[PDB]
């Protein structure tokens, strides 16, 4: 299935979308999110 | 969907953008990234 991780969306980089998200421990990852996500959202993400 | 891969951005080559990224295992790939990415970021990339 995957592991349990929560991150917060800071900046969305849409350019015809990806998101820079901060995890629980200050880590920053830029992940692929579907169109509909906004900044400030909390998302569940794995490895 | 795609597989799970993490890479680190080393150099951005913007010239009117692409990025040289190192994966988990020292591999280097130059991928297409949207405008907003910076060097040192960790990005999720597939095949």
Numbering used by the authors:
A (entry chain A), B (entry chain A): 4 to 19, 24 to 54
Q: Can you provide the manuscript's text about this entry?
A:
Here, we study fold transition between distinct β-barrels by protein engineering and structural biology technique. Here, we discover that the previously reconstructed ancient DPBB sequence could also adopt a β-barrel fold named Double-Zeta β-barrel (DZBB), as a metamorphic protein. The DZBB fold is not found in any modern protein, although its structure shares similarities with RIFT and OB. Furthermore, the reconstructed OB fold could also be converted to the four-stranded SH3 fold by a simple circular permutation.
To examine what determines the DZBB–OB transition, additional intermediates have been engineered by sequential mutagenesis and experimental validation steps (design-12–17). The 2nd generation mutants, design-13 (tkoL2_v1.2) and design-16 (mkaL2_v1.2), have ~60% sequence identities with design-2 (DZBB-fold), and retained moderate thermostability. Helix α1 (segment 2) was also omitted. The crystallographic analysis revealed that design-13 still adopts the four-stranded OB fold, indicating that segment 1, but not segment 2, could serve as the determinant for the fold transition between the DZBB and OB structures. Only high concentrations of design-13 and -16 retarded the migration of dsDNA slightly. The acquisition of the weak DNA binding affinity of these two proteins may have resulted from additional lysine residues at the end of β3 and the 3rd loop, compared to other OB-fold chimeras.
